[PDB]
Design a protein around this ligand. Structure first.
Ligand SMILES: Nc1ncnc2c1ncn2[C@@H]1O[C@H](COP(=O)(O)OP(=O)(O)O)[C@@H](O)[C@H]1O
Ligand SMILES: Nc1ncnc2c1ncn2[C@@H]1O[C@H](COP(=O)(O)OP(=O)(O)O)[C@@H](O)[C@H]1O
Lengths: 321, 721, 205
């Protein structure tokens, strides 16, 4: 399977994903040090429950100085604190985040010991504008691990009427002895399942067997010109990637349109829901229609909408047989 | 290949079928793709394919409308052939079926076809029959012209035409408003039992023709009127295609001797001539009443004629006989002898879930307002049967009709579709109808799955485990019980101080198992004793078997012993007429009946000791008063549904209320609730229960179990261990 | 063998259908040779309150019909009638007169060798480990009846089942299962009742 690194555009295989993204996040520090540290915290650390605990504790330290910027006791985060040591210091990229959002790493004398302790001390440059840390806190809290983009491998097809032309033998409708035995047994088993006394745990042991089959999905889009557009997505990919996928294939990527789900339910581009939450996993057909703002001009002018996609993709149409 | 067995659907929509995902993956079609289904007589239908978590790999789930278009029935096989070449339609001409458009006029497109197809993108093929519901009418249409052919997808830009006389239905097609399986709400278990017993001999008789074993001959349905006895039998006949011959008591009993028998045997002859067929005799108790109650020629001769006609079923191949009565003991027992009516099914009374489903069936054609809550209605309609819920929906509709029709004033033979389209039934119209409706099954005992779960019982963790083990271990490890020659226990007695959860424990195990809970209380045992009607105990045990899986709970086993004096005593002892029948029936219960018998008493020293003999209530569980942590759990459970202020210290209260049982801690909670209500009402003339209300509530509640009673209960428990 | 149990005697008494006694004896006459066993002869006396009850005597509708049929039954029919009761002090003494159940046998609690035999017989349905000392157990269960020795056997079996099931979350009943059962099983006849039974047997000599 082929993937694209969302930070560099490099083509990767399934095994090269973490190696390239990790390096791209370290390179990203030249463009936005805060965004690079945020990606480093979620992407490098596989234990996401510990990542969340470290992020919440960092958010608290930033709120302390934000709410009381006039009190110097909130300017310094102690790296030897019993909470910091377990939640923040155990993660890769949290030290870089503090430096990126205006903290300096210094050694200060302890209030009761000769040995200096490690602190992240906020500088005057960022302390003068508390709204800077407030925005950086929100950027970290809303973050997630960086995952390589699945290569969509967009394809266009033309259904061939010949696929629907087939005559069956008359005997195909004669129910067999093997089918009859299963139907007769299922009738007895269905009554036995309702008649038997069983606890919920014994029911779950069998019921739960149907819950784990898929992690990817394939989508098809039915275009008004009779052409079929297909591509591949993560089972958890956002609806916005399907709209972007279609926009890339359209002859005019800016021209507004709507997509409908497999049951006719309209999906809005502004609804950032996962494909497994939209009911489009492991597979679904979506219906394409131009926005009313577009259809009104096409119809009013008497135009025939005889072109939907780029000629660069249409030249590669395969027949469905 | 690519052929699946037709089964029932959950999604009622007429343009979609559901397959098991592995078959969609082998056919390389996606959810929402349009496919053709190949049916009988060189017919096909076009639909959208989805999937669910209930369809088997070898099955296709489709509703009645799709099966009728393919001229197939449940149990048949069809082929699936994806048709991605389907194009969008430009013009489609749809006309109604005359059988459903009578008495109604106006613009059917604007009311029915337009919202039905608008943004739905349903596949349409020439000749398709589909149903659109609304305006308290179910109207079906046929497609007569499609510009693309032979099938297309409707789009918002498709021209929809509708001009011409209504279409007369073909004689080979059944109306979509006929009774089918989707018209039955509750009693799914009973319907499944009928399917097994009836569909086999009518669809596949060869399993009995070539062998010395005969098929089932007759099924007796019983229960209160209005529960679906005739509904099930009719639905089965229509779904399978068997001819339905309807017989009833009054029709035969109103006739003169000689004519009555001629009409009865003629129906049997017609059932064979038109076989496969089902002969349904309603009000069987009127055809065959107890002989000692009548001496008429018609009542006695009709029984002999029916008895021999039932025996004639050996030759009347593909014919089965069903009957309906009120109770299994209300008919001449001759009909229940070997052969004849060999099987029986107890329909019972729909529970809260079934009542909701029944209401949803009746409202299929009704426009409901956003405030209508049918689940709330189903919970209020205790004691009602489907016949009463049908009347309830009708009365609610009639109230809404009167309110608007007084302003519409349409004086003609037909009613406009538009004015019906805007007619909605509100929650006030259902509430009004509820106040006018009167349940027909309020006298009979209602048996259903209880809503009490384990989280509703504080403490007693070891008891919760034992009750679960008594159900899981005898069935997961039968080889180990056989290996050591042990028979699993089929009952338990609960004893100890009152108000500790005896009843809740029996309900909670039934809840988790989704088993029916049958509650027998003191007054019921006393009624049988006082009225010398102990024979009714046999009916209680028989209901437990029919209700299986169920828990048969005999509360207040000492109610009669106390009525006879308890501590003093009349002229009898511990045994009485009612417990003697219970003891006799208990000996007949098997672990294979999926019935668990639970008893409870607050005075186990005065109950017939025979009930504890091996083979009966062999398990004995002592329920002590709750400890400190359990009392807190009880308070939290009692307040689980109420707003409680953060200043309320439930652990503090539990530390003081040392002698208080769960029932007594509930009194404190409810007192604090009542105090909070008074405070709120007086303030209007606070929104949560404050500590002050709990502190006052604790000043009025008292422990119900004294120190003397605690020692009495503990000594008994130690005596038996 | 014809078995009449308490519930049948109580049904006839409570329902005023003591005439059904004739059908019971008629079965014995037609089933001959047979043994006509009337269990729980005191079932009605106990249902009448046993020790307190009403102010009347031991006679009732059902025992009167039984005694009548007994007198009308000849030994020439090869029918032998056996009765049993655990409370002979509350049954109609008429049944003990010559011509009725005039032979009396006292059945005490099993002795040391009998209790061992009972334990061995009751365990014939289950695998038992070689370490189980049934003679030691019988020596301890001095006040136990045969039914109470069954309770021990059943408890030890159920304990073996419990442990066996838990091991999958054992192949036989081990000494530990019987010793543990000894802490849950109890004698059904108290020391006061044992002396009452012996003193009653002594009173009858
Ligand atoms: N279990 C049920 N499920 C659905 N509808 C029911 C049920 N029981 C009764 N009904 C409804 O109540 C009415 C019953 O009247 P009827 O057809 O005479 O049958 P019966 O009197 O045998 O119950 C029908 O309108 C039917 O739809
Ligand atoms: N263990 C318990 N946990 C929670 N609530 C209890 C408990 N025991 C009793 N109650 C309260 O007492 C009330 C009566 O309980 P119930 O089981 O009907 O008592 P009984 O079985 O003695 O009649 C219930 O509504 C419940 O709120």
């Amino acid at each position: 399977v082929y993937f694209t690194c969302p930070l560099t555009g490099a083509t990767l295989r399934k095994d090269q994903r973490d190696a390239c993204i990790k390096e791209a996040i370290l390179l990203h520090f030249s463009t936005d040090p805060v965004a690079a540290s945020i990606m480093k915290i979620y992407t490098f650390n596989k234990d996401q429950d510990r990542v969340k605990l470290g992020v919440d504790t960092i958010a608290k330290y930033l709120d302390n100085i934000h709410l009381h910027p006039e009190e110097e006791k909130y300017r310094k985060i102690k790296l030897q604190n019993k909470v910091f040591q377990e939640r923040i210091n155990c993660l890769e990229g949290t030290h870089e985040f503090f430096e990126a959002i205006g903290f300096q790493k210094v050694l200060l004398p302890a209030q009761d010991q000769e040995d200096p302790e490690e602190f992240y001390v906020l500088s005057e440059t960022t302390l003068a504008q508390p709204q800077s840390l407030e925005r950086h806190k929100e950027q970290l809290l809303a973050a997630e691990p960086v995952r390589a983009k699945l290569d969509r491998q967009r394809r266009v097809f033309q259904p061939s009427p010949l696929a629907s032309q087939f005559e069956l033998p008359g005997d195909f409708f004669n129910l067999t002895a093997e089918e009859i035995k299963r139907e007769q047994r299922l009738r007895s088993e269905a009554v036995e399942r309702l008649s038997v006394l069983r606890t919920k745990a014994m029911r779950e042991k069998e019921e739960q067997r149907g819950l784990r089959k898929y992690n990817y999905t394939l989508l098809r889009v039915r275009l008004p010109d009779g052409c079929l557009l297909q591509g591949t997505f993560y089972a958890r990919e956002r609806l916005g990637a399907v709209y972007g996928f279609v926009r890339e294939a359209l002859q005019s990527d800016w021209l507004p349109f709507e997509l409908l789900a497999s049951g006719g339910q309209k999906l809005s581009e502004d609804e950032n829901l996962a494909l497994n939450e939209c009911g489009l996993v492991p597979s679904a057909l979506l219906t394409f229609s131009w926005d009313m703002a577009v259809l009104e001009d096409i119809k009013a002018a008497g135009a025939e909408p005889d072109s939907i996609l780029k000629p660069e993709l249409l030249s590669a149409i395969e027949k469905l047989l | 290949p690519n052929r699946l067995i037709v089964d029932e659907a959950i999604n009622e929509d007429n343009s979609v079928v559901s397959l098991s995902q592995p078959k969609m993956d082998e056919l390389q079609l996606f959810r929402g793709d349009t496919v053709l289904l190949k049916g009988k007589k060189r017919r096909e239908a076009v639909c959208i394919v989805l999937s669910d978590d209930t369809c088997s790999d070898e099955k296709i789930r489709m509703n009645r409308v799709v099966r009728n278009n393919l001229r197939v029935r449940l149990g048949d096989v069809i082929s699936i052939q994806p048709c991605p070449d389907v194009k969008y339609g430009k013009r489609i001409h749809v006309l109604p079926i005359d059988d459903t458009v009578e008495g109604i006029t106006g613009n059917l497109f604007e009311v029915y076809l337009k919202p039905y197809f608008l943004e739905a993108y349903r596949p349409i093929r020439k000749g398709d029959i589909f149903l659109v519901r609304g305006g308290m009418r179910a109207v079906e249409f046929k497609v007569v012209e499609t510009d693309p052919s032979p099938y297309c997808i409707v789009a918002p830009d498709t021209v929809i035409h509708c001009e011409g006389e209504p279409i007369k239905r073909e004689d080979e097609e059944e109306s979509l408003n006929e009774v089918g399986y989707d018209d039955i709400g509750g009693c799914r278990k009973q319907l499944a039992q009928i399917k097994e017993m009836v569909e086999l001999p009518l669809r596949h008789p060869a399993l009995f023709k070539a062998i010395g074993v005969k098929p089932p001959r007759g099924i007796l349905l019983y229960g209160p009127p209005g529960t679906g006895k005739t509904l099930i039998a009719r639905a089965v006949a229509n779904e399978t295609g068997a001819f339905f011959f309807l017989i009833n008591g009054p029709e035969i009993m109103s006739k003169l001797a000689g004519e009555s028998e001629s009409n009865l045997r003629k129906a049997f002859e017609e059932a064979e001539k038109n076989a496969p067929a089902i002969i349904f005799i309603d009000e069987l108790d009127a055809i065959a009443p107890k002989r000692e109650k009548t001496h008429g020629e018609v009542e006695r001769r009709i029984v002999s004629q029916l008895l021999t006609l039932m025996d004639g079923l050996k030759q009347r191949a593909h014919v089965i006989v069903m009957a309906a009565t009120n109770r299994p003991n209300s008919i001449d027992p001759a009909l229940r002898r070997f052969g004849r009516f060999d099987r029986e099914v107890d329909i019972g009374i729909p529970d809260a879930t079934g009542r909701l489903e029944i209401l949803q069936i009746h409202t299929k054609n009704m426009k409901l307002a956003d405030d209508v809550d049918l689940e709330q209605v189903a919970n209020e309609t205790h004691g009602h049967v489907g016949a009463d819920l049908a009347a309830l929906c009708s009365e609610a509709a009639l109230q809404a009709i009167r309110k608007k029709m007084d302003l519409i004033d349409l004086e003609d033979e037909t009613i406009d579709a538009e004015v019906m389209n805007s007619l909605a039934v509100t929650m006030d119209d259902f509430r009004w109808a509820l106040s006018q409706s009167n349940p027909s099954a309020l006298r009979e005992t209602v048996v259903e799955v209880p809503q009490v779960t384990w989280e509703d019982i504080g403490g007693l963790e070891d008891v919760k485990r034992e009750l679960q083990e008594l159900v899981q271990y005898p069935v997961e490890h039968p080889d180990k019980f056989l290996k050591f020659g042990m028979t699993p226990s089929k009952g338990v007695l609960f004893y100890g101080p009152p108000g500790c959860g005896k009843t809740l424990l029996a309900k909670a195990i039934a809840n988790e198992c989704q088993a029916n809970f049958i509650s027998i209380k003191g007054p019921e045992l006393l009624t049988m004793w006082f009225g010398e009607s102990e024979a009714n105990v046999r009916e209680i045990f028989d209901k437990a078997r029919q209700a299986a899986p169920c828990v048969l709970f005999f509360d207040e086993l000492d109610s009669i012993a106390k009525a006879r004096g308890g501590n003093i005593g009349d002229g009898g002892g511990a045994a009485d007429r009612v417990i003697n029948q219970i003891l006799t029936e208990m000996d007949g219960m098997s672990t294979k009946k999926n019935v668990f018998i639970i008893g409870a008493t607050n005075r186990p020293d005065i109950i017939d000791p025979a009930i504890l003999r091996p083979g009966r209530l062999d398990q004995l569980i002592y329920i002590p008063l709750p400890d400190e942590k359990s009392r807190v759990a009880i308070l939290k459970a009692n307040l689980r549904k109420s707003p409680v202020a953060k200043d309320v210290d439930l652990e503090f209260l539990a530390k003081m209320t040392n002698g208080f049982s769960g029932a007594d801690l509930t009194e404190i909670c409810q007192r604090a609730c009542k105090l909070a209500i008074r405070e709120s009402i007086e303030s209007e003339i606070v929104p949560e229960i404050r500590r002050d209300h709990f502190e006052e509530a604790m000043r009025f509640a008292r422990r119900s179990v004294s120190d003397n009673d605690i020692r009495k209960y503990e000594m008994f428990a130690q005596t038996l261990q």
